Amino acid sequence: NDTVTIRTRKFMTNRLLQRKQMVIDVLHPGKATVPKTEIREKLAKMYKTTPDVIFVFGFRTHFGGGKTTGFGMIYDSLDYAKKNEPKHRLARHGLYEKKKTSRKQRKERKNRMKKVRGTAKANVGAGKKPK
Amino acid sequence: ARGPKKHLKRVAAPKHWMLDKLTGVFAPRPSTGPHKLRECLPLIIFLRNRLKYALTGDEVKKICMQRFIKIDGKVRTDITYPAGFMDVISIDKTGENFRLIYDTKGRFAVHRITPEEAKYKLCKVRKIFVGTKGIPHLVTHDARTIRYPDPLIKVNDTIQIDLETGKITDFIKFDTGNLCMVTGGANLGRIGVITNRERHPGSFDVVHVKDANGNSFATRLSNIFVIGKGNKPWISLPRGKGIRLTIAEERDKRLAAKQSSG
Amino acid sequence: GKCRGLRTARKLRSHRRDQKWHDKQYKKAHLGTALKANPFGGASHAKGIVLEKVGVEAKQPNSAIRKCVRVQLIKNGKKITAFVPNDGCLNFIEENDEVLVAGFGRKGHAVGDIPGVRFKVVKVANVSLLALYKGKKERPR
Amino acid sequence: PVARSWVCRKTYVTPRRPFEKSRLDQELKLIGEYGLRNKREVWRVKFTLAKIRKAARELLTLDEKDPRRLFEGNALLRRLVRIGVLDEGKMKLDYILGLKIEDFLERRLQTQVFKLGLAKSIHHARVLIRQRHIRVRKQVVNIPSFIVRLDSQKHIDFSLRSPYGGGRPGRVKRKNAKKGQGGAG
Amino acid sequence: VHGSLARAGKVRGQTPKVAKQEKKKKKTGRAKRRMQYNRRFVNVVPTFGKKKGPNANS
RNA sequence: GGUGACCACGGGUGACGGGGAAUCAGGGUUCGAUUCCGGAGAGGGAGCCUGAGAAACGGCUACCACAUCCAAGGAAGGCAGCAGGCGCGCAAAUUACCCACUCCCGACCCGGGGAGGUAGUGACGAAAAAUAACAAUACAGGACUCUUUCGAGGCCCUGUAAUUGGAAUGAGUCCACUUUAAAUCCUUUAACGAGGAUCCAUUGGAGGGCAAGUCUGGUGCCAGCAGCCGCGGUAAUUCCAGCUCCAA
Ligand SMILES: [Mg+2]
Ligand SMILES: [Mg+2]
Ligand SMILES: [Mg+2]
Ligand SMILES: [Mg+2]
Ligand SMILES: [Mg+2]
Ligand SMILES: [Mg+2]
Ligand SMILES: [Mg+2]
């Protein structure tokens, strides 16, 4: 924490997705890769925002420690951040849930429903028996 | 095949799209539109690879579906809409306008224009035919056709289409001594003046063009777009004024720029 | 002499492709009868079943009993004779073994003092003869 | 199908005839004098010089004032004087044919640290580079075959994390210290 | 068959089995190249012999 | 009538064509099943509906060859798609995860995609690159020097072997971060981690071609080696071994 610094570059703003995006590098001379949460709040202090709208990813560390570079994303509002931002990053921040079944099981149910025609009760009870 | 193709491999994409090899297997495959897919710039790569407003196809799809991209004064939500030559791309939320013009190396460059200049657009007439009730027509280099043109307008001349009306306000005849631009082939992107036109019946006419620096080249007639009345262009030219300069005088320009910046 | 006219290319190429049939390598590689006569059928290696164990007398200046196996190939059922190339590797060979046989060095020609033998055993029962000779692994009892 | 590239090339050529005393002795002399691991990484620099000389000879066969000849000649001379194997005043295609593989081997990082004196021998230089002790500018380099340019020549120095610049002594030093303090109060 | 296969492996059978002498490991790679460069490139011998080979059986 | 020694016609192809690949003075000679373009096919043929587009086969109809269920009255088939089996073979991978990327389809910002992406097997092949470095003692060597061989150290470079002898690191264990759809791997980074540093480099050779032994012990024209010359019939530079050397 004593020697960790954020530096921004390729900064630009767009109103198309209502955000400002940049590529940043953080300097840890002798420490591990800085945690994305730490980048989040430090960049929030940098741009006078809160560490709930900050979005960072793609942090690759140069050979031999020291510099690591990632792509930073800041939005004007959390509602816009929810509106246009990938669901996996929303789930990383905990704002999106993926509590669903496997792709294989989903395909099994989709193919089993094709054997039953029209009848709504037998079309919704298709996957009830072969669990 | 048993029908039309609706895929485009990444390596088989047009070279001027400046796509790489490792991102994926496929290319945008632009939808049918006013321009052929060989010389069109789809909006996905225009807003992802040229301006970096979007990082992915999904993001550029969101940008398009929020109805901010305006092409030729009309809102287009097609992610792979073929933009093409000198169609005005207007974004009002961020307030800039783009004119899609080839650079000196035959690639669509990011050319920014004022709104009062973006209000209009040059077109190259491709055919003139009279239709029913004796009504003349005019089909441009786009898919755009219009009725009741000036009878002085002939084939492969230039017309001034102002947006939001689709009408003609002025025109440039294809005449010796007029400023042109090459729209295909090796000399793509070169601004020059019509010096000669040799015509070969039953084949393609060849036009000889000299630029400002005196470099004279030639190209087929179908690759020429008249852009100026004599020597003043009717549009805003990109950087370099469409003057193709060789690698010998490109390298030392790079060295001078590096020396100035260092 | 040879013709040198500007439009003699037809005669030059015709004479070349006629005369190219007179050397043994081109004839062997392009006639196909050598490919038909080859027991391996143009393959580097082959598999077979050991029909018998035989001894072959060496040539005139030498005097030895080269140890070979009479082997029927699994494909096309052709019967060949394959040398067993080490000091005691015939003992690792028994009847009805599935042996792998390769060429014996010079492309379907006999090598050394062994008359009419063009193949050698590389593996027996899916274990290498080199491995058995060096004792690095054992026969599959 | 797959979006790979599979564009690769070999970097060395084996000699046409093996087992000749003159070539074997010359290659062994080079290996011993420059601290190379094997014959592959001297055939590699020989191949590089062969490619450079082939390009220079072909350019020489091109006519004078030919713009392709001029452009590629200045490019090749610029690269050669950046890597430092050619003097800045010898900007001619004829002098490229006069180069030798010793000039290229002298520009290796392994040789350069030994010449600068960061290591006591060429083999010590190689192991010192491999154990992440040598840095160029700010990047640490663990590749002995790192060709050093003239601008990067001055910026070769010990790494900060290594126990030769900054602190943090090695594991054996720390173990010896803790054993010593556990033996003596 | 004429019956001469009974002698297979005869000499390898009769050869007395002597074990390999346990020896120090040999340097490999760059160290090996350094060693064999030092042996035959940096040395001065005052003895005659007309440049005898590296495996002299003196 | 039309075509043919300017090679028609017929036959063969272990022939899909091309962009290209190997080799590399120049000229050429071989290879292109294989990711890009074009063509053809969906077990073999044949015929069709629909549709803008199919003679479609993850559409239909019939025959042939296989082949599934059957209550024997019938009914249902097409992996040269992704995986995965059997067979054939000298010969070729996991019945994994995901639509996160590139794009495609649809009424469509929202769904779907074994296209494709990711991981697993992977010495096909290509790039980089560990298996050690340094110092001090003995015994040598140097254009070494100090008195002119004699003796030594004001120096340098090897090898032999040691209580040396304390410095540097990984390969591995492994916390966290990072990566990522989620992981993995790489790069970071805690803590352990080297003195037969036993944390052990192999594959082929030592008559010539062709670098390397006229060493030693067995065998005795036998066993075997040997691409070719040739070696072996009791003193083997060539076999089987030990040691020592050679090449990568
Ligand atoms: Mg065929
Ligand atoms: Mg092909
Ligand atoms: Mg194809
Ligand atoms: Mg078909
Ligand atoms: Mg069909
Ligand atoms: Mg090892
Ligand atoms: Mg021996």
Side-chain angles (χ1 to χ4, degrees):
Chain A
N1 185 37
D2 50 355
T3 311
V4 163
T5 186
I6 300 296
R7 297 176 68 89
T8 194
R9 80 170 181 270
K10 285 166 138 36
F11 178 88
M12 61 89 90
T13 184
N14 58 4
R15 274 83 72 188
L16 296 176
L17 295 174
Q18 311 91 20
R19 74 204 189 182
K20 308 199 285 292
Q21 55 203 12
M22 72 291 290
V23 62
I24 60 171
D25 55 356
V26 62
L27 282 72
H28 44 102
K31 318 164 195 176
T33 319
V34 175
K36 276 183 299 186
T37 75
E38 182 66 27
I39 297 90
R40 270 182 71 200
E41 64 254 6
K42 198 172 188 296
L43 186 42
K45 306 181 174 36
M46 189 162 160
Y47 274 95
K48 276 74 69 177
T49 61
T50 61
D52 59 350
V53 67
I54 306 299
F55 278 102
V56 300
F57 60 99
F59 277 110
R60 318 303 289 278
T61 301
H62 295 105
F63 183 81
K67 274 191 55 188
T68 185
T69 306
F71 188 78
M73 298 190 92
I74 63 171
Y75 289 84
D76 48 352
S77 66
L78 183 62
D79 55 24
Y80 289 165
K82 298 162 172 283
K83 190 175 295 296
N84 50 19
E85 185 68 26
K87 313 301 189 182
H88 66 269
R89 286 179 214 156
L90 274 297
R92 277 160 190 199
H93 285 173
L95 281 71
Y96 186 107
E97 58 87 19
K98 203 178 173 61
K99 260 60 199 170
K100 55 174 64 65
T101 187
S102 163
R103 198 182 84 132
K104 180 58 68 179
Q105 293 179 356
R106 185 153 70 257
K107 291 163 174 307
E108 300 292 284
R109 180 176 173 83
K110 188 260 293 179
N111 279 11
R112 281 197 303 272
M113 286 179 35
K114 270 191 274 191
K115 318 288 273 296
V116 160
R117 184 255 201 281
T119 61
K121 63 94 176 179
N123 209 1
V124 305
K128 288 309 170 199
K129 327 188 183 200
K131 69 182 178 68
Chain B
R2 285 173 290 144
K5 303 291 213 62
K6 55 192 73 172
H7 279 98
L8 186 59
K9 302 295 194 160
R10 171 63 69 116
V11 74
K15 185 70 177 295
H16 62 102
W17 289 1
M18 300 211 284
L19 293 170
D20 53 353
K21 306 149 59 175
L22 267 297
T23 48
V25 194
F26 294 105
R29 184 66 191 198
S31 66
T32 55
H35 303 88
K36 306 187 161 281
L37 69 92
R38 306 299 310 173
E39 67 273 16
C40 84
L41 195 67
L43 274 296
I44 183 167
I45 60 173
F46 177 69
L47 296 147
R48 190 183 49 181
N49 298 114
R50 293 307 102 83
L51 303 172
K52 276 91 179 159
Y53 287 161
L55 298 199
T56 49
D58 298 76
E59 292 181 354
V60 73
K61 178 253 295 178
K62 305 193 183 213
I63 286 173
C64 282
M65 293 301 292
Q66 297 191 21
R67 298 178 74 83
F68 302 139
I69 302 309
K70 207 183 306 308
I71 306 151
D72 271 21
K74 292 183 181 180
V75 167
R76 302 277 177 209
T77 61
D78 200 0
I79 183 171
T80 57
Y81 182 95
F85 186 47
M86 75 200 312
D87 287 333
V88 176
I89 316 296
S90 290
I91 302 107
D92 291 331
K93 192 171 183 70
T94 61
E96 70 273 15
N97 292 319
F98 300 105
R99 183 79 67 107
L100 210 55
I101 297 174
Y102 301 98
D103 67 341
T104 57
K105 291 194 192 307
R107 316 177 306 229
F108 282 127
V110 180
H111 185 92
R112 298 182 181 272
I113 46 172
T114 59
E116 69 274 15
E117 193 276 332
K119 263 178 56 49
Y120 68 70
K121 161 188 178 170
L122 290 189
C123 294
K124 166 194 182 159
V125 59
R126 282 211 179 147
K127 65 176 68 176
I128 293 168
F129 65 98
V130 62
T132 185
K133 314 305 179 73
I135 303 306
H137 287 254
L138 191 140
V139 182
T140 71
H141 82 281
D142 307 329
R144 155 186 288 106
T145 176
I146 48 180
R147 315 192 294 142
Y148 304 123
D150 202 318
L152 282 182
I153 287 151
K154 300 287 97 176
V155 179
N156 67 11
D157 290 7
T158 299
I159 57 169
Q160 182 63 259
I161 298 298
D162 51 347
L163 302 178
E164 301 290 329
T165 65
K167 294 180 176 66
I168 295 183
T169 63
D170 207 358
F171 64 97
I172 316 157
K173 207 94 159 165
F174 183 88
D175 200 271
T176 300
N178 288 333
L179 194 68
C180 67
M181 183 176 177
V182 185
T183 55
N187 302 313
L188 182 62
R190 295 187 79 173
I191 299 294
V193 168
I194 301 297
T195 68
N196 189 52
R197 165 172 182 217
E198 55 185 20
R199 65 185 68 188
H200 313 104
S203 159
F204 307 99
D205 290 15
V206 176
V207 62
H208 302 262
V209 180
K210 179 209 293 315
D211 55 4
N213 292 48
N215 290 318
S216 194
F217 50 95
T219 193
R220 288 184 177 181
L221 184 50
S222 68
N223 275 337
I224 282 291
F225 196 110
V226 180
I227 68 155
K229 178 52 191 56
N231 61 350
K232 276 75 176 175
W234 280 11
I235 60 170
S236 66
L237 305 181
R239 270 152 65 90
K241 289 311 156 295
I243 300 283
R244 161 159 307 157
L245 58 86
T246 81
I247 46 174
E249 68 272 16
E250 192 275 333
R251 148 178 59 77
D252 47 4
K253 278 186 69 175
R254 284 201 297 105
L255 303 180
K258 156 169 294 203
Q259 192 270 340
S260 63
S261 63
Chain C
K2 65 179 73 174
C3 55
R4 290 191 207 274
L6 277 175
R7 55 178 71 97
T8 58
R10 169 180 289 107
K11 189 199 181 55
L12 284 182
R13 69 180 300 161
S14 293
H15 184 248
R16 192 81 281 148
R17 76 172 185 267
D18 285 320
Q19 291 308 300
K20 270 208 270 200
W21 288 108
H22 287 98
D23 53 348
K24 291 211 278 193
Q25 292 83 18
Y26 191 97
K27 195 80 172 293
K28 175 179 177 183
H30 296 94
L31 207 56
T33 185
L35 201 41
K36 301 295 171 65
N38 187 29
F40 277 13
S44 64
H45 291 62
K47 263 170 182 77
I49 301 299
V50 172
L51 293 182
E52 206 198 3
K53 283 149 83 157
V54 299
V56 181
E57 280 289 12
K59 280 299 191 62
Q60 166 80 97
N62 288 294
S63 191
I65 301 298
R66 312 275 164 233
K67 274 80 184 159
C68 295
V69 294
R70 180 70 157 193
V71 165
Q72 184 178 2
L73 298 175
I74 284 157
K75 61 168 193 187
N76 70 60
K78 276 173 191 182
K79 296 180 182 180
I80 62 170
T81 300
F83 182 57
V84 177
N86 262 323
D87 205 295
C89 292
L90 194 86
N91 319 319
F92 305 110
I93 303 298
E94 68 272 15
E95 295 293 328
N96 287 340
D97 290 332
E98 183 178 1
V99 289
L100 187 78
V101 285
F104 189 67
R106 52 192 294 176
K107 283 82 180 171
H109 191 201
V111 183
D113 52 7
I114 318 167
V117 172
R118 283 84 60 85
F119 315 98
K120 71 181 193 298
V121 184
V122 175
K123 305 176 64 164
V124 60
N126 195 0
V127 60
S128 168
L129 276 182
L130 191 140
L132 299 166
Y133 188 81
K134 291 185 183 292
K136 311 176 85 71
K137 63 181 73 174
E138 185 66 26
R139 279 280 332 279
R141 281 287 96 187
Chain D
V2 293
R4 326 296 164 73
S5 81
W6 50 75
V7 168
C8 60
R9 66 168 80 235
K10 299 217 315 202
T11 44
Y12 76 106
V13 167
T14 67
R16 167 76 173 81
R17 57 178 71 248
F19 318 133
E20 62 181 0
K21 291 297 295 294
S22 65
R23 188 191 45 81
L24 285 180
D25 291 331
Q26 184 66 41
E27 280 162 332
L28 196 47
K29 182 179 183 293
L30 298 186
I31 280 182
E33 196 276 332
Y34 290 108
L36 313 176
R37 168 174 94 253
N38 51 7
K39 297 286 181 71
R40 210 200 281 117
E41 65 183 1
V42 65
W43 300 342
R44 165 213 303 156
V45 58
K46 189 167 76 171
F47 190 47
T48 311
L49 183 67
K51 286 174 53 153
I52 291 172
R53 291 188 66 255
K54 171 154 175 289
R57 163 166 76 258
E58 193 274 334
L59 280 188
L60 273 172
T61 60
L62 276 72
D63 190 359
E64 183 65 27
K65 187 175 174 66
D66 180 352
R68 215 188 61 91
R69 151 156 182 170
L70 269 164
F71 183 78
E72 292 180 354
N74 305 120
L76 173 64
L77 288 164
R78 189 189 72 92
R79 295 193 275 111
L80 283 188
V81 303
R82 285 183 78 244
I83 59 174
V85 306
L86 195 47
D87 178 273
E88 204 266 330
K90 267 173 206 167
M91 302 297 273
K92 296 288 185 301
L93 290 160
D94 290 338
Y95 305 138
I96 307 177
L97 301 186
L99 292 175
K100 295 178 284 186
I101 54 181
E102 291 84 3
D103 291 330
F104 281 77
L105 282 167
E106 191 273 331
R107 298 303 311 168
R108 289 170 47 109
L109 190 49
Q110 168 181 358
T111 62
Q112 279 305 318
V113 290
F114 176 49
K115 293 295 177 69
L116 272 295
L118 300 158
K120 314 171 88 171
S121 66
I122 193 74
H123 302 74
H124 178 223
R126 209 202 173 77
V127 306
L128 188 66
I129 286 178
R130 285 298 298 162
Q131 306 162 339
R132 299 150 160 265
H133 294 270
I134 304 304
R135 88 193 198 259
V136 181
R137 301 243 163 202
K138 293 182 183 293
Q139 171 62 272
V140 295
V141 189
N142 72 313
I143 309 284
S145 49
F146 176 89
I147 304 302
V148 172
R149 317 205 185 102
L150 280 193
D151 59 356
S152 48
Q153 183 63 75
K154 191 256 290 180
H155 298 76
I156 297 145
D157 187 14
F158 271 120
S159 178
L160 305 188
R161 304 287 310 293
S162 66
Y164 299 122
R168 208 52 176 75
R171 76 187 195 191
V172 288
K173 181 70 175 177
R174 297 185 277 126
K175 204 191 182 189
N176 283 25
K178 62 179 67 177
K179 186 55 70 160
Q181 56 95 42
Chain E
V1 67
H2 49 88
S4 301
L5 300 151
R7 263 169 290 111
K10 190 175 77 72
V11 172
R12 212 203 188 200
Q14 319 168 241
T15 299
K17 214 68 54 186
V18 61
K20 294 178 143 101
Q21 304 216 270
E22 309 294 87
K23 63 184 74 67
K24 190 181 54 185
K25 64 177 284 187
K26 293 182 183 293
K27 294 183 186 294
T28 60
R30 182 211 72 255
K32 201 180 146 181
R33 294 292 175 173
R34 163 175 212 198
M35 166 281 282
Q36 65 182 177
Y37 161 81
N38 270 349
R39 291 187 292 113
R40 68 182 69 187
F41 275 69
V42 55
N43 76 315
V44 167
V45 292
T47 311
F48 199 69
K50 301 178 176 185
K51 301 295 186 291
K52 182 62 65 68
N55 204 41
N57 275 357
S58 178

